[PDB]
Ligand binder design. Structure first.
Ligand code: GAL
Ligand code: GAL
Ligand code: GAL
Ligand code: CS
Ligand code: CS
Ligand code: CS
Ligand code: CS
Ligand code: CS
Ligand code: CS
Lengths: 341, 341, 341
């Protein structure tokens, strides 16, 4: 037993950026770019086999498959092997981060890469990723279900395998989930004694060029909401903080930012309008308030369901970053199509 | 509903090149090289879903899959998503160029890459390609069927997305087709206000190293012929011209070349002999006659059909390029196998 | 007719290296590295079609598919097209080397790349590989079955296609096999008039940076053993020798090394313990005895079969290389899982 699946999603997206620093014409406005873009098409193979008494073996190989022909490689999307049974589920491989799964109730938009921060809640999703790791998921007991996941010190840094001279970048991920009559709330987060971030607060591999080492890197996320009776509402809160670990005068100083995201949608028959807001409060960088990281964004859109597998998509987004003259505003809109197989 | 398809084609090809400039031994003759080569094996996944009243959703991901293990990546061959119905068909993605489809009645040979110009009509097919774009194909009305296709300015040049400082490389492609009782004629072509060509008259991405910018780049192709009753005959004509747009003394001057190709084949039971000729008249480069682009080529061969999906292939080709001492002659022959699945 | 297959295999492996030259702490011992690693997962598509009277067409595209997401490309594992029938089988493409197939009775261990020499008989398998080539396999007559395979001069070196100025790196591979009532012995080997080796006695492509050209490169392997009644025993012998062909003072001098490998395993119900030993006698490099190439290794382990397709794996290995102060000792152990589909 093995099945083939995936989804092909593409559309045309119009965008324009307002930046006074990089564009000098007309009050900092760039020209409007119109493109055909892949919304992240993917194709995978998964299978399962009953082993006898309550245990089943499970594997999956999923790849990024852009219909523009820009992707390549196997298992770059969730791909794994594991075992399931009464005890729950245990998987190893390129695995989604518990915080990446919790992303399903946080970001419901589709878009191309270039517009992932204005046509989708991309900024609050800068903490999500896939890591080579092991992961446990306990069954659903009384509406409760949980997940614990770990990334080895030698998987987070291979170069340092035999000479442990760099602080371990090993990390733990966990999440808890409660569901009842259409009401659901969940906590998801991750902690890393030592890790590296780029200037976009995203986690990068040790020794990336412009990467800033950090200590006690922790990410927290709580998402609660209602999903049933043609109605969907979702509020999410997220806190991120770490201590500067880059040798120099500012080592030890604190980094932190709070983000909130809101989304609601109603299902009229085959049309589902939807709206989402997101904000990133002023961020503390090296102990000081940094307003460059503050942002406000709102996305409105609707999905037309031709069938349970095919949808037509339309959406627009207004995004503002920073404050003052270093400020950047992004507006974009798209129309596209999604087919799940 | 989703299907798996592709074809595996390989063979051994013998070749020798006669060039007085690069080879000094024996009147300019090179040694004879004999290789095992992939004839362009490929594998793809496509699927369709009825949406209700006369509309069907359609997608396809096809990749180059060489059995020599030299290819990599997804959707580098025609890959797309679109909709079909009474109105015809509409597709977006890595799509074949209307001129690339018209190639089916122009080049019927199989070969490895190194011999695509001597074991196949490759020179007349230097205008064919795949471009990220949208494309319309109207139904077949009274033997008539048509196709209109467009490649965005920001898809033909991504770097220039927000600062339109480079002339648009957006292009249009169209073709018309008539079929009646085994008789068929079609026009296919493309126009680009601005584009770039390499010295082989092939279109390359803006800012390729040795790439010459051009203006009013247009390609025309007419192919007519008979295909039925065990008989196949096909004549094709092709015109290409553009104005030099490379800043300097020769900007504005005219480039152009006319190419013709002929092919016929008769089906004795399971054997199908075939022969093809092709010529490239002297080309006008910067207004001046250039005989380096002139060429003559003839390919003879036969296909043995073991079954409708499997064939045995044999072919030879004599090709002469240019005139005089800069002249190059290529001769090659091959025996191979093709399995379609 | 076409089928999908492959296997997903991963596990965690603990390792430590003892080298006095590269590690200075504690008598040359490195720290112990613990990793999650792909044991070489792979996925392929193969198909066959009856052509009529006793002939069938056969093709296969197999790719390395790591569940860690580190592989990419098509047909990098055995991939081919060919014909089968009364006469036996004939294939062309990325094909396994006759010596690579004989590897099945020589190395029965699973492991990640980093531990292929301590958790598997990797050193004796440094002569195995895949080469673009043609290959014949004659049927099994009276327990006897044979294989002859060849790699073209222009496939082993493409750059030199038209100017044969580098000595041909074309090579021949052959093997013979006898099987009777659980008893089986086979010879497998390869010869190359000219070839290139790296310092690990592995064959590399001409013009690799640190590659040493050789002449009369021959590899011999005899493997005999018993496989039936829950019992498996296998002894293998291997000889390798070539003449230095690197221009200089030592050209012409002789290189050679003898390797032996032993493995046995008994099948209690679903558990199969197993043990293997391997030795590499002192090697003659440029006529002189080199003890750096001498080695001793022993691997113990067991496989728990959950089902015919799924197994649980456990293994450990002690490996010593060289002699004296340049000496290197490797110890490693792993626990993992393998699912065949
Ligand atoms: O949020 C959008 C995504 O939803 C998933 O369930 C689906 O597998 C993807 O193809 C994509 O449509
Ligand atoms: O012209 C040759 C080609 O014909 C196509 O129809 C087929 O899909 C390919 O596999 C290749 O055989
Ligand atoms: O030696 C181990 C291998 O055995 C093969 O037969 C199987 O196809 C592979 O998946 C791997 O398990
Ligand atoms: Cs992300
Ligand atoms: Cs990552
Ligand atoms: Cs082409
Ligand atoms: Cs192209
Ligand atoms: Cs090997
Ligand atoms: Cs090789």
């Amino acid at each position: 037993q093995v099945t083939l699946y995936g989804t092909i999603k593409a559309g045309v997206e119009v965008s324009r950026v307002k930046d006074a620093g990089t564009y000098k014409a007309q009050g900092g406005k760039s020209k409007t770019a119109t493109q055909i873009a892949d919304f992240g098409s993917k194709i995978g193979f998964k299978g399962q086999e009953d082993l006898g008494n309550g245990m089943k073996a499970i594997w999956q190989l999923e790849q990024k498959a852009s219909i523009a022909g820009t992707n390549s490689g196997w298992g770059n999307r969730q791909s794994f092997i594991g075992l399931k049974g009464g005890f729950g589920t245990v998987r190893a491989g390129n695995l989604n981060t518990v915080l990446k799964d919790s992303g399903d109730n946080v970001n419901a938009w589709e878009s191309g890469s270039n517009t992932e921060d204005v046509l989708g809640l991309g900024t609050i999703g800068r903490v999500e990723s896939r890591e080579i790791s092991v992961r446990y998921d306990s069954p659903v007991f009384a509406g409760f279900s949980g997940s614990v996941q770990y990334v080895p010190r030698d998987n987070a840094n291979d170069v340092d395998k035999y000479k442990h001279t760099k602080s371990s970048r090993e990390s733990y991920h966990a999440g808890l989930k409660y569901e009842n009559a259409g009401f659901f709330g969940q906590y998801a987060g991750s902690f890393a004694k030592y890790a590296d971030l780029n200037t976009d607060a995203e986690r990068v591999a040790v020794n990336t060029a412009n990467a800033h080492p950090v200590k006690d890197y922790q990410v927290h996320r709580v998402v609660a909401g209602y999903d049933a009776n043609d109605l969907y509402v979702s509020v999410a809160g997220q806190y991120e903080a770490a201590k500067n670990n880059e040798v120099g005068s500012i080592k030890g100083k604190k980094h932190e930012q709070t983000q909130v995201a809101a989304t609601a949608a109603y299902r009229f028959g085959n049309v589902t309008p939807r709206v989402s807001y997101a904000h990133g409060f002023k961020a503390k960088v090296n102990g000081v308030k940094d307003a460059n990281y503050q942002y406000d964004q709102v996305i409105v859109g609707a999905d037309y369901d031709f069938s349970k597998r095919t949808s037509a998509l339309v959406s627009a987004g207004w995004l503002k970053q920073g404050k003052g003259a270093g400020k950047v505003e992004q507006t974009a809109s798209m129309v596209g199509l999604r087919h799940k197989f």
